[PDB]
C-alpha cells in the first residue's frame, strides 16, 4: 500500500533474494525439481539426421523372409533324389 | 548523466559540428527525449566522468560514476543503461526495469560445408551401413545351401568354391547363382529388390540434403556445454557476469565456474573485445559468457559471424536511477511504466538493434547451394 | 475474495482483488504473482519485480 | 591379375568391360578379379547416386526461385535495386506512405549505398 512502512524492506528484500540467488533458487525447486518431467521432453539429439533402423528393418525382414522361402525350396528340392 | 557506450550511446558523424544535444545519438537518447515529453522539462545530456559504471570502491569506500554524480547532488538524473543491484538501491532510486536482461553464450556461427571421408556414410546410418554386410553374408551363407543342381543318385559337397560364389553377389546386381537353378532365382530375386530399396534411398537421401542444408550442430543448453571440454568456455577477468558463477548455488553454474578456474590456458579475458575476437578465431571451439544485451548487437554487426546461443541465467534490468529525495523520481518511474505499455521501448529496441544493424535479413530464397 | 487479481472496475470504478484489499485496508501487503502496471502502481506500491 | 607369365594384348582389351557394366566377369572367373570389380560397382555406385542426386538438387534449385510480380516480394530482396526519382510525386508518395510496404521500400531507397535515384527517367 501507498505509504506503507513495509515498502522500502520488501523492495530491498526482493534485490536481496535475486542476487543471492534464493528466487532462481525457488524457482527450479518448484518448475523443475518437482516437474513430473525431469528431464528434456521428447528431445533427441538432432531431429532426424539421415534414417532410422525401422525404416530399413522390413526391407531386411523381407529378405530374411526370402532367404527362409529359398531354404524351404532348397529342402524340397535336395530331397527330390 | 550517461556513460558512451555501442549503442546504446554514441556520438554522431559530424559531432564537432552543432553543440548541445544534437551531439548525440542512440536508444538512451531516445529515451530522454521521449522522458521530457512525458514528464515535461528541460534536459542536458552529460557524459559520466571517465566513463565508470556504477560502483562503490572497497578502500576509500567513494561511489564513483553515475551513482556517485547523483549522490553528491552533482547530476540530477541519470537516464542510462545501469543495473539495478541492492549495493546501489540504498543510495540512489530506481525506476522500473525498461529492459530485462541476463547472461548468455556467444559462439561462432557453424559452417555447414563438411567434406571428408566421415560424411560419405552419414546420409545412411552407423548400424545401416554395418547391417548391409550382414545381409549379404545371410544371403551368402543361403546361397551356400541353394546351390543344389540335379545329379543321378551324400553329395559331392561345397567347400572353398561356395564362398567364391557368394562373394560374386556383393559386386554383381545379386544371385549370380547356378544355370537352371529354381532356389536361387528367388535367392537373387529377393536380394536384388533388397539392394535396390537400398540405392534408391540412399540417392534420395542425397539429393534431399543437398538442397536443405541445415546442419544445426550446436548442443543450444549450458548443462551439456559444461559437460563437454571441447569447446572452451569462459568469462570476463572482473565483473558481475564472474561473480555470478563464483557465488552459485546451482551446481551446473558451480561445475562451469570449477571449469572456468581450472582452466589451462586460462578462459578469462581482459576485455570484451579480446572474448569477441577469441571467439571469431577459435572456429567455433571458444564461448564466450555474456550480458544479453552486448551479445545480441555483437550478433547484429559484421562480420556476423557471432551468435547468440541459448537463453539468460538471471534476471536484471536496466532501470534510471533518480536521487533519493528528488522530485522526479515517481514522475519517472510512470513514465517508463508508460512507456513499456504503449510498445516504445520495444520499438525503439527493434529500431536500433535490428533496423539499423549491419547483419541484415540477406535476400530472400536466393541460390547459394551450387 | 473470489480469487480475484488487482483490477479496477468500470461501471462502478471500484478496485477488487489484492491491489482493492490493500487500497481499503483490509490487507497489509500480498505477496502474489501481481504484474506490475501503471494502473495498479498510482493506487498502490510495487517492489521491484 | 591374369596372364602374365614372362606387348601384351590380352590384358589391355579385357579392362574396359568392367568398366562400363556392371560387375568384372570376363573370359576368366577368378575371386581376385571378383574383388577387384567388387570395390568398382559400389565405388561407381556411390558416384552415379551422388551425381542423380546433385542433379536433382539442380533441378529442385532452379524452378524454387521467384520471378516475384508482386512489390512487397520486390522489397524483401537487395539483390535487385530498386529506385525512383530524385524529384516527384512518386518519391514524395513513398515519403507519406502509412502502408508497412512502401515505408520499407522508402527507408531501403532512403538508406541506399550507392543511391538508387536517379536524376532522368532515361
Ligand atoms: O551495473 C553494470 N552495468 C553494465 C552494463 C554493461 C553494458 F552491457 F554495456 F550495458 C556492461 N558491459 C557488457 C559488455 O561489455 C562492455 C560493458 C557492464 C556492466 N557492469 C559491469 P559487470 O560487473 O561485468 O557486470 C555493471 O556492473
Ligand atoms: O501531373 C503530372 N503529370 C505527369 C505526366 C507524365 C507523363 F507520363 F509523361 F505523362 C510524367 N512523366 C513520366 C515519365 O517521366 C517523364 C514525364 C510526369 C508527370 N508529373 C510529374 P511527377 O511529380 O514526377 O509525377 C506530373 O506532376
Ligand atoms: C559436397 N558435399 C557436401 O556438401 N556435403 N556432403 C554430403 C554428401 C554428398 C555426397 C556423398 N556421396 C556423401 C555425402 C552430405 C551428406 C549428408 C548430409 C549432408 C551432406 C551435405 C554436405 C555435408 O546429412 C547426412 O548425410
Not at chain 1, 51 to 73: H, P
Not at chain 2, 37 to 56: E, N, P, Q, S, W
Request: net charge positive.
Amino acid at each position: 500500500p501507498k505509504g506503507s512502512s513495509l515498502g522500502t524492506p520488501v523492495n530491498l528484500a526482493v534485490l536481496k533474494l535475486s542476487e543471492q540467488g534464493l528466487l532462481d533458487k525457488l524457482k527450479n525447486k518448484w518448475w523443475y525439481d518437482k516437474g513430473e518431467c525431469g528431464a528434456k521432453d521428447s528431445g533427441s539429439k538432432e531431429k532426424t539426421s539421415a534414417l532410422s533402423l525401422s525404416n530399413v528393418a522390413g526391407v531386411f525382414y523381407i529378405l530374411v523372409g526370402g532367404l527362409g522361402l529359398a531354404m524351404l525350396v532348397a529342402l524340397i528340392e535336395f530331397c527330390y533324389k | 548523466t550517461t556513460i558512451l557506450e555501442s549503442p546504446y550511446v554514441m556520438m554522431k558523424a559530424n559531432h564537432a559540428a552543432l553543440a548541445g544535444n544534437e551531439r548525440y545519438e542512440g536508444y538512451c537518447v531516445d529515451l530522454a527525449a521521449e522522458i521530457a515529453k512525458h514528464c515535461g522539462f528541460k534536459y542536458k545530456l552529460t557524459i559520466v566522468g571517465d566513463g565508470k559504471y556504477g560502483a562503490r570502491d572497497a578502500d576509500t569506500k567513494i561511489w564513483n560514476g553515475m551513482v556517485g554524480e547523483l549522490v553528491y547532488g552533482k547530476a540530477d538524473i541519470a537516464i542510462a543503461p545501469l543495473t539495478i543491484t541492492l549495493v546501489r538501491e540504498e543510495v540512489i532510486d530506481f525506476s522500473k526495469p525498461f529492459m530485462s536482461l541476463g547472461i548468455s553464450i556467444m559462439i561462432k556461427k557453424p559452417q555447414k560445408s563438411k567434406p571428408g571421408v566421415f560424411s560419405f556414410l552419414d546420409p545412411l546410418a552407423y548400424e545401416i551401413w554395418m547391417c548391409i554386410v550382414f545381409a549379404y553374408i545371410g544371403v551368402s551363407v543361403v546361397l551356400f545351401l541353394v546351390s543344389r543342381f540335379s545329379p543321378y543318385e551324400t553329395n559331392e559337397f561345397a567347400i572353398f568354391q561356395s564362398a567364391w560364389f557368394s562373394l560374386g553377389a556383393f559386386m554383381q546386381q545379386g544371385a549370380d547363382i547356378s544355370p537352371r537353378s529354381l532356389s536361387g532365382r528367388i535367392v537373387g530375386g529377393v536380394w536384388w529388390f533388397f539392394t535396390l530399396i537400398i540405392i534408391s534411398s540412399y540417392t534420395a537421401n542425397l539429393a534431399a540434403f543437398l538442397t536443405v542444408e541445415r546442419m544445426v550442430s550446436p548442443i543450444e543448453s549450458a548443462e551439456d556445454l559444461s559437460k563437454q571440454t571441447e569447446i572452451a568456455y569462459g568469462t570476463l577477468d572482473s565483473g558481475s557476469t564472474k561473480e555470478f558463477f563464483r557465488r552459485s548455488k546451482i551446481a551446473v553454474f558451480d561445475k562451469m565456474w570449477t571449469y572456468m578456474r581450472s582452466a589451462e590456458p586460462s578462459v578469462f579475458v581482459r576485455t570484451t573485445a579480446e572474448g569477441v575476437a577469441r571467439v571469431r578465431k577459435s572456429k567455433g571451439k571458444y564461448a564466450y559468457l555474456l550480458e544479453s544485451t552486448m551479445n545480441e548487437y555483437i550478433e547484429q554487426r559484421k562480420p556476423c559471424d557471432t551468435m547468440k546461443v541459448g537463453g539468460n541465467l538471471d534476471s536484471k534490468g536496466y532501470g534510471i536511477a533518480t536521487p533519493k529525495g528528488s522530485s522526479l523520481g515517481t514522475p519517472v518511474n510512470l513514465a517508463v511504466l508508460k512507456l513499456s505499455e504503449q510498445g516504445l521501448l520495444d520499438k525503439l529496441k527493434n529500431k536500433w538493434w535490428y533496423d539499423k544493424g549491419e547483419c541484415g535479413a540477406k535476400d530472400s530464397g536466393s541460390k547459394e547451394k551450387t
